[PDB]
Each structure stands twice: as structure tokens, then as C-alpha cells.
Ligand binder design. Sequence first.
Ligand SMILES: CCNC(=O)c1cc2c(-c3ccc(Cl)cc3Cl)nc(N)nc2s1
Length: 208
Amino acid sequence: EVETFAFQAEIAQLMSLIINTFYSNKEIFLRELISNSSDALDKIRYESLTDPSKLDSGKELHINLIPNKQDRTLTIVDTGIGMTKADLINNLGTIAKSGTKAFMEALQAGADISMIGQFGVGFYSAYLVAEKVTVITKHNDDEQYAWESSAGGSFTVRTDTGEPMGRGTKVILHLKEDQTEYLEERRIKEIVKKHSQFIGYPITLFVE
Ligand SMILES: CCNC(=O)c1cc2c(-c3ccc(Cl)cc3Cl)nc(N)nc2s1
């Protein structure tokens, strides 16, 4: 039903660093997630030029941002390529076992956290604002799975019993209690407009 996995030691230490380093510019997390999405839509757009048959589970290639004050969550939803269970398990828990060592040296040599996307591990910035992250993903190959983690060394994968969802990936941030500014419409618009104004796909910010 629920499988529990250990972060590979580097990823866990990176996560630790991200959660523990005092660092005020937290808002860069959104750009990292919006940018993961765009890649994933690129990558599905790519494969449907040799099989316009993969858009059968979707076609509309977009990114939604969904704030919810009462659950204190901000969700970044994309209809991109999605991940299989092994994608999910490898490229969240291992996979850039590499891009992570690079980053953590880079951090000496006055690199600062805001340049995390350059090493392919931007996703982990979500931990600047969230006590818990849930990733709901559905790939053309496979079932629909829920990945989950509040850090602390491990994560879980279970098959998703929730809203079936076409194809793509939903990242749900359960916000830290003092980062509820990222739930707010003007706060979000300012950040999108500042860091992601030229993304190739529509980004719809929902209202509550
Ligand atoms: C099967 C090929 N797809 C992938 O490898 C993907 C990884 C991601 C990711 C992703 C990438 C890196 C990390 Cl550390 C975490 C995630 Cl959720 N996000 C999104 N929104 N879509 C995809 S598709």
C-alpha cells in the first residue's frame, strides 16, 4: 500500500542544508517548480511529434497555480510528461546524487541557494517554504502515484487513490506556518511576473 524509501545520503544532506540554511530570498522556489514544469511540457511536446498519439490523455499544454488558504497549500499543476513509478522513485530520491555534490561545493565559492536550478535540483527548494511536499504524477506508461515527504531522511510512494488526472504532475506544497504569504494573489503574481515572465506555456493563477 505505502512504500517507504530512504533518500540517498547526498539528497538528504542537500535537503537538510536547504531547510537549515538561514536564507531570506525564499521565493525562488516557484521559479524552480514552474521551470521543472516547462521542461516536462517540452518533453511531452517533443515525443508527440513522432506519435501525435501521446496527447490522447490531454493535449492542452499548460501550468496552473492553485493557492488554498484553508489547507494552507500551494499546488503547481502541469500537463507535462509525468513520471512512472521508477521515474518518481529514481529522480526524486537518487538520480542527481550527482548534480547535488556539485551544488554543495558550489555553495563555497559564494554560490548561493538561488542558483540551485543550474544543477538540476531546483525541486528541493520547495523545502525553503514547505514542511511537506506531495507530488501527484500520471505518465502515459503507468498508474497514477503519490510521492510524499517532509524530509528527515525518507519519502513514501503509494498509488494515488485521488483525482485521476489525464497526464502530468501536481506538486502540492504544505506551507510552513509563517510562509503563508505565498498563498496570496498579489504575492504570487509579483513572483511569476518577476522570475517567470517568459515561460512558453500559459500559467493560470487561480482565485480562491
Ligand atoms: C519520464 C520523464 N519525466 C521526468 O523525469 C520528470 C521529472 C519531473 C519533475 C521533477 C524533477 C525533479 C525533481 Cl527533484 C522533482 C520533480 Cl517532481 N517535475 C515535473 N513537474 N515534471 C517532471 S517530468
